Amino acid sequence: VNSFSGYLKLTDNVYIKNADIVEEAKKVKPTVVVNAANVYLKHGGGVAGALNKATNNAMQVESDDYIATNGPLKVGGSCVLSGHNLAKHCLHVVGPNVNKGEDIQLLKSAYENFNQHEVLLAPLLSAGIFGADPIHSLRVCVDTVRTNVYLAVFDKNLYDKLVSSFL
Ligand SMILES: O=C1CCc2cc(C(=O)N3C[C@H](C(=O)O)CCC34CCCC4)c(F)cc2N1
């Protein structure tokens, strides 16, 4: 039993809700919140910009130190950093950005990072400003993640389409 509330159950391990991931994280304080990161951990917009804003830019400060030490992530890769005031940890995961021409096949590799964590609060990878089809992202999520994932979908119209079209 966990403290996630109001989710629709899609499969044995995947749950979904129309919610602002920032507000969800502040309420639940999950062990892991997933950020929709880029390889530079530049959290300018989308989910990343919103999460970073909620940390008062502390996420960005920590991220800049990480990159200065380690260099960029790989598309499809991840790193674990602090969750600041939002969660114990933030798993920064880089899905392919279609508006940069990146290979959508890397979306499965991106979701594989979730399997290293028993429970996660997460957005749909490569959705929103990353330009992929969110219906496809949900399919890859369900077919790749085996741990317990609670998906927050900001857009109510998109949430209803994802539920109604889910096979
Ligand atoms: O107030 C807020 C704060 C957080 C927020 C995030 C996004 C966003 O970039 N999203 C979420 C979007 C959804 O779940 O509808 C699906 C696509 C992604 C998730 C990961 C890739 C991009 C947005 F469009 C609006 C907001 N509004």
Side-chain angles (χ1 to χ4, degrees), residues 19-22 36 46-47 50 123-130 152-155 158:
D20 181 346
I21 192 172
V22 172
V47 168
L124 284 170
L125 298 180
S126 298
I129 69 177
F130 281 62
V153 177
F154 180 58
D155 192 75
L158 176 59

Side-chain angles (χ1 to χ4, degrees), residues 101-114:
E102 292 166 353
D103 182 8
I104 194 63
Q105 309 302 309
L106 289 169
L107 187 55
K108 189 175 183 73
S109 301
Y111 273 117
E112 287 171 344
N113 295 286
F114 288 24

